[PDB]
């Protein structure tokens, strides 16, 4: 709930840490144009945890929402904001023709129409230099061989659905097995020992027996896998003890 | 809780009638077939059924 987001070329990233993931406050908003998670399901975020989650904010001309996706090409996809092929997150985009649009013309957004080379994923290029397209060395002024690469938008409410300003929010979280802080309001129980019971520390469900071995885990390591990539040892988030996950009878 | 259905509200709060048609496609005696037409019942010959 912000009045004005950042520009396309100057998209702002918000770091989130030590949070209780409760995404139920987002479903009660207006029906979003495109709510598609590329690595998870939208109804499963409240039952999982996140290591590092970042939120990006940028407003586009609406019809360019298809460009914010892995493997897509275009102006914004190659010059302003690119998503990697191994992207794991969710894309949230809704209509903002009533907020980020003016009847006389809103000129507070740029999209970097011209650029020398393609932009790499998850980068920001806010250089306001004059794009030299010709051979003569451009002296930073507008000329027949070099123009202004930063072009303004024509956001007006008179345009139909498709040219209106659409606020896009990209949630880039990391679900890799690692010491995390954001897990949600999931409640805690008692720590039993030497019995076949379930375990759910940071979303890892299963059935095993805790043995409390003498494994020396490093501060940045919490999960450990065997040859078959099966997590057989975990570090308790609350207590600094080491507990192994051994299969039952 | 009651709804606040009013024609002044735009898309997102207007009343929308939803009809869910649950069917049963397992092999069983059916009586809700589509209209169509019945033909002749031939026998002892390779034909469609």
């Amino acid at each position, epitope marked *: *709930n*912000a*009045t*004005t*987001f*950042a520009s396309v070329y100057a998209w*702002n990233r*918000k770091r989130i840490s030590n949070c209780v993931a409760d995404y139920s406050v987002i479903y009660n908003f207006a029906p979003f144009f495109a709510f598609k998670c590329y690595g998870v399901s939208p109804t499963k975020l409240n039952d999982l945890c996140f290591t590092n989650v970042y*939120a990006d*904010s940028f407003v586009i001309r609406g019809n360019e929402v298809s460009q914010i996706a892995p493997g897509q090409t275009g102006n914004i996809a190659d010059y302003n904001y690119k998503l990697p092929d191994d992207f794991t997150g969710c894309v949230i985009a809704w209509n903002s023709n*009533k*907020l*980020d*649009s*003016k*009847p*006389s013309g809103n000129y507070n957004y740029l999209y970097r129409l011209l650029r020398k080379s393609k932009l790499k994923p998850f980068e920001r290029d806010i250089s306001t230099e004059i794009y030299q397209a010709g051979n003569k060395p451009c002296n930073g002024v507008a000329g027949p061989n070099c123009y202004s690469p930063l072009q303004s938008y024509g956001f007006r*409410p008179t345009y139909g659905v498709g040219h209106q300003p659409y606020r896009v929010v990209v949630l880039s979280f990391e679900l890799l097995h690692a010491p995390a802080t954001v897990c949600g309001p999931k409640k805690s129980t008692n720590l039993v020992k030497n019995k076949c019971v379930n375990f759910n520390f940071n979303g890892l469900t299963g059935t095993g027996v805790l043995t409390e071995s003498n494994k020396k885990f490093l501060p940045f390591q919490q999960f450990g896998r065997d040859i078959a990539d099966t997590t057989d040892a975990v570090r308790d988030p609350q207590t600094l003890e080491i507990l192994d996950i051994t299969p039952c009878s | 809780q009651s709804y606040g259905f*009013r024609p*002044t*509200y*735009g*898309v997102g*709060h207007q009343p929308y009638r939803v009809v869910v048609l649950s069917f049963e496609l397992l092999h069983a005696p059916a009586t809700v077939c589509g209209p169509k037409k019945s033909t002749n019942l031939v026998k002892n010959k390779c034909v469609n059924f």
Partner: antibody
Amino acid sequence: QMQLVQSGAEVKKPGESLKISCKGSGYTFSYYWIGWVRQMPGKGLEWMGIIYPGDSDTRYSPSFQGQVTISADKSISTAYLHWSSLKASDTAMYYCARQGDLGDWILLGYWGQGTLVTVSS
Amino acid sequence: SALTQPPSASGSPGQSVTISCTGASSDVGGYNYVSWYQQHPGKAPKLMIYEVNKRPSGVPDRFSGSKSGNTASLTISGLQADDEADYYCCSYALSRVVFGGGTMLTVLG
């Protein structure tokens, strides 16, 4: 010329509904956010809520969610402010504001004249 | 959040005064979501200073604005007799406008 005209002074008693109006002219009354600001005698400004002339997109203040409702008529380009079950503390000055050609969507650069409501039972 | 403003200000004509405004929120859009309004006794308020790095049209250069951290400042170069009015600051960062307490401008005692 853009201008905002409001209704005259209304003197009522608590326990009775009240619906003041504020008509805007000289501009397209379909894209400019219309809101209301409460000003108690001797106090500061208090925001209650805003409306959109195109479609019903009402965002009320957290302290004025169900205490007051705001509506408008796009056919005649006139905004309204309806009350229900007035109390003795509702006596204050009310203005109608709209966004300008520049700034944010809740900048409220333009204002009206002012409608003084007093019950004081 | 709620904004805080001094109860009143004093300044002789010709000198400069500064109005404080502490409590402005922020978001991922920016930190310049501070606006000022002037309301004379007996009329509707008027937008004088918003987006303190700029200023609207028809407003003299006497009214200037600034912001340092979570505290906003309203700088008036020249003080005149028609400047005695209530000045309020507004924070519109989190899609919610909040008006401060208010400060009345006058001359020395």
